[model samples]
Target: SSQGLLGYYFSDLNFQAPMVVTSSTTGDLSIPSSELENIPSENQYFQSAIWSGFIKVKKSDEYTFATSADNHVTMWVDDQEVINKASNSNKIRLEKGRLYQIKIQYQRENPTEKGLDFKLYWTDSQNKKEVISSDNLQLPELKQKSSNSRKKRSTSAGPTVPDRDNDGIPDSLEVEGYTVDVKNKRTFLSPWISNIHEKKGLTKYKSSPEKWSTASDPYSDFEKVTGRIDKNVSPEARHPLVAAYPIVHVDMENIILSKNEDQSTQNTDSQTRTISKNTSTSRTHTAGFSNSNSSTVAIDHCLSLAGERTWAETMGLNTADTARLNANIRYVNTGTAPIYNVLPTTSLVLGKNQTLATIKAKENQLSQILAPNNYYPSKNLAPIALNAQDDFSSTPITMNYNQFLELEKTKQLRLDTDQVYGNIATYNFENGRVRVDTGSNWSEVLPQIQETTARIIFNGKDLNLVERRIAAVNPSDPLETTKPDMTLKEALKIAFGFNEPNGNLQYQGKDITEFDFNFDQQTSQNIKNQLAELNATNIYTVLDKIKLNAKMNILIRDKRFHYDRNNIAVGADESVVKEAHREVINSSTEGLLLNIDKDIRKILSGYIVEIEDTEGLKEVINDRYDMLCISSLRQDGKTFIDFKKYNDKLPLYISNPNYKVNVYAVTKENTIINPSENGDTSTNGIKKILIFSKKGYEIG
Candidate 1:
């Protein structure tokens, strides 16, 4: 009938009353003990199991059967005993095309073990040691019928509120949304529902039979996620009021944590009495004030890749609105790209080639495997033991959107377009195109980005920019032809003749079978170096480095916060030292100096001050008042002023401030005593910049 065994499971080592009786299968007897897809381990641990079935072999042979398990095991072939109590093997003779009764009895002897690995293997002179195949295994024909082996699921009998295609939620209150109990409605005098609950039924986004069912089996997945489907969600991804100076409030929290040795006690050896008699009193005042302060700093809303975008953006609102949005009619001058002049956290690179004494002392071949190895413990032959191995992927832990936003506001994290692009790049490989949170792909994602200022920085791109131009100018004829055609030559055969078992004569035709698989840019070794091309993004790379340190139990702190400073006198009187400490926080760097002309100085006095020539303003004023733009000599220019940019590769501000990357004029609104605008044209030596040339840029 079916392949595999009728597995009977017991809760205790005694194999007494069965807790679960289920059908379990394996493609091969090599049952994977790691992932849940294989074994039916409904009862997690400390259980006994008996798998009784028939194993049929195709050919007769003198075969040795082996059993490998983590706990107590006793396996039998027919009435003959083979493996017992341990992972061992036995030689047995069998005839071709015959059924043999196989019973594998196992017990998870301990509760402390982490995983279960129980497999049955066999081999012969002509075969390699591998799992016994399922083709030669079977359950009895009658075994397919359900006995007491049904999984516990809800059954219906009562007259209930209407149901939607049998989804557990009653159709009546289904619009009242999920998480509502009829008993729950009457919990208080009135039923209260948060308008905040986002589209309630997740299955609305998917088409599982029950509301709680997820994982659309390709057979289903038909919901278009409207942010307004049913209930709403919590607010985490909302945009900041970018134009305002944001307020940062630090809260002093009172923490009640205990310290064993540090006890605060007050004692009164004498006290006032009615008769003026002396009395002694003592107080065990153990709790004291311990202060901790943390602040929330508003940042660009889109940093948390999973952060909130305007709900309208998701419910299919923005695209139709963009054309109207661009119609807002005023322009004065091209604004200066406010070169996000934030200071960089100094990079202190340890020499890439430096070898520490500890590393140098060990022999190169054996160094990593042993020699004071601290992380790995010994593999045990204990009656039952689970092995936990070390991981070195340098990958980051899965981050929650809320977790990311909270860390971002607290200054432990930052947003980089590079990272966002990297994230898109990272997530591109998901075969199922769904964001894990809301279960919708770019259909729900990119539109959100399209609405944020983050898109302005990324040159209006909602996806990663790096990719192969896999097609040609006339893409109707794809570069990679489906009918693979290639030349046939002797040298190709001489070098790789063994590839075709049919022999080199198979290449006799002018165009033969495909063998070339090398991609254009692969194996050229250029990919690694390009990761540094500045279009160089490494913040995510650093995230993994931080995670690596964290995994190794290493303590990490930002070096910038603890730079060289004056030492304090530890035992000195408090007030004078405090005053000195307060005065020491000043340092300034030489930067842009603006000796503005009389016309523009009064306008500093600013609203988006951009640079432009008077003639340019004169030409545009009649057509469109002061329609100005930023021009880089090579490209014609871009008009509308954007305060933010995505790519750092483009010049926001150059490292050397003396580049004098600006020229200016002013446009005051209608009512003005502004004739020449307090006209004094002479300014301190109108700034001329000395541009630096890179080896690649300055050619002959």
Candidate 2:
């Protein structure tokens, strides 16, 4: 018994407690192939185990320890853990003679099928590395175990209590034995228990009597919540308490031009740069419609020769000539967040009368209303380590919103929209509903786009298409009097914002560059109608439109000109819209607004509405959302968190969302939970809620 360590075995994967225990003073964790013979091979797989012993250090210096496990394993020296879930090494200081406890535990998912290799190693001050020497280890003292050594009243001679609960013999004061009640067939008498149950009362000669009472098993001491927050850790080392999702939505992106597209640049301005031609040539890019002629003899053409080709057509006949260079208008993400969303979901809730202590004492209650991430692993879910569960905070720097901004402008600071990218809708309009809502998950909000995210795709294919055809023709050559006159730059720049004009360009920023496509009255109205049809409100749309126009301007220096972008493809089907499967990257302000509203409606979805209280907070919940509060009551300086029943059952995750997350939570977690209620904190589990501001909501 004094030769090797004591090993506790379990047939289940979780080493909640030992089902069978054996001891040795000369043992090490290898457990060995020889020991396997003693256990049925079938009994070994899907099992876990632990060992405890003490070691005496020889040198008074720092030492390093290591653990190895093919699966998962952990180790501890004295009360300090030297190995975590995986292995490398842990350094600790050691003295010469004291007995320091060495604890080791491991979980095995598979067994004899795979070779087992679990080990604990150490390197001394002499740099001597070896397995824990059996020569230096000893069995734990009797004080660490043994029932007689523990404190308890020893009344073996007769009865131990002064007749409380008034059963014939005193009921165990510490043990929770079932009392005689209507549900009892199981509550047995102490008469037979004292000696017969304890072993003899004439009729019994039972073997293995310890199984008779299920109360107070040897391993009950092993199950308790432990582990903690690192009190003095840096934000650099610790994590922030929120989740983020950065997104940029694009309703449409497209390109249109008179011809094929070609030409590309290795660089664009650090910011997007825009350019445009100042003068309008005012010519349509029709093949037979050129105004330019090789001769001007028409003014003096004299008499009867004017019998030209006046046979077939009327003036200004329309032609379907322009082509869509690039199509498909779906949402795309913007890379502004770098890697995350510009906003974040709550991690932990901090609210009224709150501090780490107030929060700590009610962890069992607080967990209810809190957001998803602030939680701990269940006790006995893994090997029990020590920290007392008082893990409150870390090497923390706390500040207010303004201060955070100071640190930010001065540090800096994720959230949502959409179900998926988007789809082209109906037969008539290319616009469709974008489902990015608070309820959407990460994959839906920030989808993959190119190498990163971008808002609108403009001035792309068709713009290049226009310039390519123009590049091949010299501005001064030939007899053509006029050409296709178009102004893409000004519209692109004005809507896009950053504009500069030489009287030709208009500014809305000192940095803003707006250009004008000195087109005559007819073309101006066409561009204006397109902008209005989309019903855009503020900033984003303009900047993007102007940018689209911006790229168009840089192409025509007035020294050269090329044009056309009219055909926004419609299928040749019977009904143009019904046949419209192809989409373009043009958008409506109203459509973008819908995207915004969906985000807020979900993010700020659940709040106080009606009690039905003093008229609201009284009615039972109808629509079922997990985020809601039920009721609350106060008694004797304590508040009881009212339980909620949906159909019928209790819920989990109780705690108030921080005021900041008021949009997220139901009033339920707002109740101050009284651990004193029902004499049980676990058994215990509202407010005026708001949905939307309605005409008669004032009654609450």
Candidate 3:
């Protein structure tokens, strides 16, 4: 009753049909079709079989099909031999109304083989490759009569093939099933392939009388690997083949000051005026007992020095016995705009007894001392947002500080370096101070400064203390000098690109503005002896001297200037001692040696010596930084990236000292990723390697 093809079996190794059929069946030709169970006691291998069926095609579209067998097979559709040999795999298109005759002949070569397998697959215009299901197979009417006769003889006559397990295997063979050797049981059949042992098999049965085999289980690995099962289709389960993550890398090459159009305007004497001073004086004297004085020859000289002291004081001179008038005039630009130059008025005041007419007459004759005001360009400055990670050449135009704050508060203007502004030392440096321009609003800038200061409490190197002091002073005045107590080594670090400490400061009770050293004569001679032995080639000793001198300058500058000398004059024309210091500091070999501090040494130590280009190709430079030679510093269960294990050196940039470097890991491929694409500014699974400045921080 099963709707399957009529299968013909033969005893010979070849399809010598018309001679004898050792077994025959009426079943489908699908890989695991129930139609195969009817093979009359077919051996494991070395058998021939033929199947003839009418295939129904509902569509008149182009079709593709293929056939597969263990050793040999031939297939045909409507007299067209689509597949000829066991190696045959081909497809064809047929009209919709035709009931095509699908024929297959299969042969196995050896008897030792355990599994018998043959299959057919088809692909119509609407679908990909799929197996021809049992529903699409049927027996030919002409062969059906002979299939009945063979079935009747095999069932009622002759000895019956006992199948106790009823799971496809004959009972007699199940006792001595497929195994490499019965003694060791090393090559027994896999549980996934058969269930001949019934209850002892690795599969479940429906009931005692009803046994199911792995052949019917779609989840079986056999069908999964061989593509034998035809699963139902749904729209949600679609897998498309598209290329992802091309072999390319992106790098941030240069990041520096971004250029903008000049915003400065030329200044002129747009407003100039003159003012004048007028002076007038009157004097009188009285005498009593003049008649008696005439006989006494009284003479008072009639001299009064009433204006002597007052005149000297009024003329801006000290009141001395021989004081001379020294008139002082002040010329000032009391406007908002900066004045390049100011001229004083030259007009003079006349005698004390001059009347109104005389004063009017001398007004034109007075020599002028004041000239019209002169001016130059005025400053209208704004700070740019630059950092190590900035792509300056392509950096987008950013708004002013106030605008940035406004947009940032509204969650609109997030940037890569927003955390930079939250550090007090960041603002203590020159580059960060540019962002704190005086032209911007103080109220807005003040909050940001305070917020930055509040967040800095550890490892700030006292920069937060200086920033707090600066915030406390007059907001309009220049920030007061706030120098932290620095050591000889600390001061030397500044010359090597560290941030300069603040102000006219005292370092360890020694004023930084002047150098004053005192010691016994013997001690001084020892110092001289040390200096006498100093030479240029000795980098270690030369660095010591540089540090000593830099320390002295650090103390000297504090006492010699009212403001902090943030920079030391270490140019080529500096004093010989300082010149030597500059030379040694800038020397490549010495500088490289000095940079081997605890932090930088780790960077150099863990660095990968092998090089990898942008195309994901890599080559070893030398045997120095091999994987076996790397030192693993990972403790406390922390993750560590061992650079020495592979190639692809990380690129780094330093926009400012004491700040995190912009470290980029050259990717093996160009992945379409954006930090802001997801909920947070994270690079998804891709890594954005961030390295810190070689100062104090470390990785576990």
Candidate 4:
């Protein structure tokens, strides 16, 4: 009584020899009686019979049906030989709510063959896979006629319209000036833009910067877009990186790839020799080498709105850097209010004017449709096809991430840059808060500027100066609410590492310090070469222009280095020098210079000349001391002299024969010659500097 539609039976080979008991059961199409009494377990050989009642399909969509059997099997659908004995599988495109007949015949000849094992599966329109279950099947007598079907089992169908033009495509679906192939059944309109449309004024409309500033969904329907649709519409159209987010544009500029080809060969020869020739031996030679060439190509394209702050934001530069960008803009504008400087490019306006609400809704909808990892080839038909008559337009090849990358590689949709010429405006960090004067709505430009600035200025050695300044004024309010006054120089000092909070510097709090000068090895080399080639009379003239390049590194001799076990002794006497170096000052513009007076210079000369390792002493002293000297600046207009250690002195000797020098000075233990001895005001501290002369040196 619990039995269902599909009938099952077992036998050997054909139905000869012995007739097996037949039964009816329902569920997934599988042979359940493999352990039946009639079918022996060991060395068993048996044929199985299976039949399913007509099935009612719910929707009209393309589907793929599959099934596998142990030995051999044949199946039929709707009285049609779908799975032939040769292949045992087939795919059919059918109508919705229609009845589909199913039948399967299996055969096992060898005694070693096992009982039948059979299963059926299928894929839906949404590309979802599932097993063909009994729920969709039923006995033919129980199968009711679907209201949507023309007849219960009728198969009379033909194209409604004829191809009057004799072009293969039916007149009903044919467009003007296009012909269709009569052999191919599927046909659709081509979606590719044509030169005719281009010549006939189709590329005029431009998307409003105000209306479509953010990325919109590329797969959204033309009618659903916020602005008016241009004549030439595209399926994949949107900013590359800024989509779904207000990010900076991706200007690839150019891409360079290099590969090396290597070749190898080995030659071995043996020669028979006589007496003296016996020494003439065999030699083996082998060599391999690689040769490569580099190729670079530039493509011109602008992805989205471009600006310094936006660029720095994407580069993950600091907020101070963005403020520096603002300062640059100010300097270019002669210290006037600055504006955002976006690279100038030929704007390809495509969309018509649109309302804000409609634009926003369209953007939201498009973003949902074009989400990453959501690519589906079957559902999203290609908007264009090679054959005009074939319906290839609806069967598009899916554009997955890999395919998009390939397109970029092929230069079909290249990413590039178009520099903005002339002076451009940038955001103003004028009174602490960022502002822009674009003449347009401040509400639109200001928010984007602030968002871009916050992302770029993420972290730093100290807390973000922007946030720190903001906190000092109002700990509760947003940074934008208050307009704290911070000059460009004041903020830049902190950015370039010339200013540090109290107790932050490794040494005494008197000198400003930083850990990153933003100069790489290559940059330092280039600056050195440039300075060496400069030939000018007044040194100050060259100094004024090149002074900011005085950025340098520091080598702190942490007292622990002398005792740490990690320190390795390089010279005699186990003297381990574990001094570490770090690049600090960003530029000399932020440095506070202090010139040593003649008296302080005398003290430096007294102590430095005593060092025994005077070989590279000039270079050593130069490396030891940075150009800036905040620590040496004294309150009384005199240089502070800190001669507390043997290494505290800097050597300076030159062609100034008119000047005199002394050697005796205070010791590291604070011991000094009495006034009765040298009588040079036994001071323990003195300013250190790099001293040298092109004319040579002498001791007096």
Candidate 5:
């Protein structure tokens, strides 16, 4: 069954169950989930048989959003009156799991949207929620044999994707179409059903003796819902009882640059860095100094011209230049490690006539510029893995800040104001380069002038095509390539994070780098912390991939035709016309169903009776002889899980602290779930109990 109902997404027609109607003008919508009653079907509403059911959910672990139609709905999840609507719509977040009573006052008042719909969605801290797993719900088509009047077209003849359940359902109906109606749930076939696979009452039997009473079957023993919440487990064991879209939103990040800017060394006294140039060549022998003309000239020009250029190119430019040096910082992932944004770097070659001694001499003569060198901390710790999703009270520590300061000192690095990295919108403006959101990307935001030439302009009537160009070139270089926004799993494999593998980097399997370090210890630690936070959120992403691929083989299709305890009608006859009419009526509570299953059984059973071989006979009579089954037991374990076991659906996760676990679930490899068992005790066959340990850890 699909986890939830899938109607038109984000549309009013979408089903929103457990809704509260409120006045649009006065409703403050910040309601919680702790003040409703469970509309039990067993209870009579006025004089009518109410077909209502209770939905058990966890708290905080889910944001329980509900929508109702033609009805005044109110909900109470865990003592919280989460949703209350006098007339329109009400939504709320269910924080914790416990006794949640839901109440709905329905009068079928068709409001704004046509075909009244009810919807309920919630999200947890990990930000995972349900979505429409199926595209559309429909019954499978039946296999039919060619008539004698027409010649056989193709040689291939087989069961044609059997839907042996005879439930008038298709396999795709479960995955891409319909959701299980929790209100009117399907009853399972009893374990004692021997004729579950028999197609007796499906088609008209040639032998009259085969006809029998359809009431011979019985109902299954699956559990139903009750509003009473169990309170034994801790609150932490409870999950949020709501469903919603899981999302993590954050604000902007700040980058701090000191005023007393020394691209050279950090000083304890200064909070900010100042960039000033000296016209006079005065010397100051403080630390490492040199009496050099080149250093002084470079510093003067850098301070006066480079700083101004950086500011103009970044902020003051009306239009970005076409050809110029561009720098960028982008997130790149290496498969299995933390991600990082590579900073741009450019090295300036010292003049052939210039020497380091001379540069030092200039600094010693004039306290204007200082030669920069890489500084190494002596701790020799591993580099911290890069974590892009971290928040800082003030500003994040920049790697090689000293080096970056040196670049800033030399006018090679500058403040960036580009939105190229993150999600941004862009479009061309007039004929000038595409106009983009301010601070969207560095390349476009801060631009420099470059070469151009002007061509001829047409005057009056002369039909001539000509263009012009200008040759002004930008002094600075383009930006460096940054790390792309990729997952840590992907980023780890690349030489871009802490614990970068010391493997031979080969294009086609040949060794390239003897060894490489993506980052140092400082970066790795930060990354590790962020990863721990991401595990919960990322697990859903992994589950998404799995849900799209993995599914439990709930073999309910083949059991439909057989006289299972769940399918047999009380008074209908097995053969002749009584079975067909009852089959049509069973699918519908008020009216006759489409009878798609009955029709298929009609055509197929007719052929099975003509066959002589037992196996061949069994092929067509699968529903008559066997019922499809769902088992949560080990494949090699004694017997398949029967009706007595796995009668109720497994609890995917703990919904409330008091909500005792009802099902035992594990990975296909037999690993018990760890998330469900972190704070709770384990049991062999307790309801809702699950273990996700590795194959050899606990479950095995």
Candidate 6:
């Protein structure tokens, strides 16, 4: 008897062997049974053999799926477990050309009284390609005919822990195996409990059940993760289960991996050493330096969209830092968004039009197949290859948190004025919310901008956003209103529509149905136009630009160390050259100045005196002197500062006599600073600024 429900659910059960029992409480009220004596337990799992009938499938093209369980559930599709409810919210992956299978084992008191309702289907992220197994299902009697569904068999004599991925960690250590590796524990223990002798039965430390005393799984080896979880993790030992679900397989080539039950050589710490090469040329590469030699070496985390957020917390800085630096950030939308920055990496090349090249390629291929190309054969065969083709156009690499932090720190450390050129713009688009990081950061800046360009590009159109909103929203359409109609599609349809003489739909040339299909058609002008456009596209747009020649600002504390009249030479013969270098470094436009702690006023006085006697050096003093943030207008009624005076956009480096200078961007907008702070207040002369205009500000 089928235990029907409005929604789908699955669970794992410890049941009687050889015989199975089934009963539905909310379903088509029925109790059922199959064989008992000769029932196979090894291959036929999840009581799937109870029905002894096949449900015709209409292969789904969906790419996303979600599964839930009432008790314990373990599901496999094409030999891979995509959903493991041994814990909670555990899901695997699905691909094309694979036969999906679902196995549910529910835990209940008596087998006969309990009914199992396991469902299997495919639904992409959009929910457009869903294939429901039971939409029009009807209720059945509580006690139906019993074939061999119920049996009374003994439970396995001992308890055993399950390790799904066989990474040597017990699934018990993981809630749906979603727990992150804290890596902070001093003890290098494998998180999984395995069938090692040291942990075997009759537990005394933490009392529980005799069956589950000290039992472990089959695999015995354990390894360690190198990085520490964030500081906020509770108990200091408990790592949170974010979407950080990674399925790692043992490398048979690794010397540390142990195949034996003793499990001595296997160590997570050793395996983590492999994570040292964190940065690479591919998207699959990992970045970070766990060790000194490994620094600047490797990258790769095999991280999923959720896994990225979990791993990012380990990085000291958050999305805020990246945004402040003007890096573009995008996130993966799986209900909630995941952290995915659109930082500029030289490895990735953008499309010319800045369209998503990867998605565009997929769309292009789909269009090509729907319409035909007749370059060779009259029948259209798409040029796309499945297995041999490289779907990943960019390299597959990973970036660990540590390496990312270091790279960010390196950028911040080197910020000298001479190194970098020009002012840069930074924009942050959180859906429709756009904020530009500017110097002023005015109080009047809008909290959120509703401009058209930002809305259309970042937030997408309202209709598109509405579609996403409606995807998960339920509607007033009653499913009961529609009846399940037979189509010439399933197995029954093939026999009825094609094999029979007077089937529903005849296979006429003009009126062919599913059983009778036609060859490729190249007539659709719209599809042809799309293909032409796709063919015309051959460029990738870059999302991030690499800032060139960034420099770091440094303060010289020692007068001797200051950029002086001469360069500091080291060796015996190099002393004279070093002295000359020190002099040129200090007195020249390039040299360091004073060594004052604060108050640039006093330091600028000494600097002026030192450079006053130098021939043309005094021009630097007169031209770029006594600086303070300028007010828009002065009481003297004249413009003193002029951007036109400094017409060229050549790089400008300035330092107080104390060698502390704020590197200001001398834009055509702000070259004239009103030097009213230290100047005489009583003087009413019009000597400050001349005129302010876009052509450039002028100083008289």
Q: CA lDDT of each candidate? A: 0.26, 0.28, 0.26, 0.27, 0.20, 0.21
- Candidate 2 vs candidate 3: the TM-score winner is 2
Candidate 3 wrongly placed segments (more than 4 Å):
16-42, 86-91, 143-700
Query: What overall lDDT, based on C-alpha atoms, would model 3 receive against the true structure?
Result: 0.26
- Give the residue spans of candidate 1 off by over 4 A: 17-21, 27-43, 87-89, 141-700
- Top candidate when judged by TM-score against the true structure: 2
Candidate 4 per-residue C-alpha lDDT over 425-498 given as tens digits, one digit per residue, 9 for 90 to 100: 21111111122224333224333332311111111221211111100111233432221222222222322223
| C-alpha positional error of residue 265 in candidate 2 after TM-score superposition, expressed in Å | 99
Ranking under TM-score, best-scoring first?
Answer: 2, 1, 4, 3, 6, 5
- Over all chains combined, what TM-score does candidate 3 have? 0.19
lDDT of 4 at 613: 28
TM-score per candidate, chains pooled: 0.20, 0.21, 0.19, 0.19, 0.15, 0.15
| Stretch of 10 with least lDDT, candidate 5 | 213-222
Best by lDDT: 2
Tens-digit lDDT track for model 2 on 1-700? 1244545555567754233344433334544433443234455443676666566766677778775662366667655767767756456888887656666777776565422345567787688887767666654432212222211122222112222221111222113221111111111111122322222211111111111111111101100000011111111111110011222222212211112111443443334111111110111121121111110000111111122211011111113211111111222222111111121111111232112111112212311111111112222232111112344432122333333223212110100122221211111000111222233233432322111111122222212112111101112423111111112333333123224444233333222221113322432343456567657543333533422211111212111111223211111211321122122121221110011111112112122222232312333332222223332223432212222333235322212221111111232123222223233322112332322221222211
Model 1, 315-342: lDDT tens digits are: 2222222100000000010111010111
| lDDT tens digits by residue: candidate 3, 307-425 | 21222233222212121111111221111111111221121111222111100012223122111121111112211112213433522332333332232222111111011111011
Angstrom error at residue 643, model 4: 99
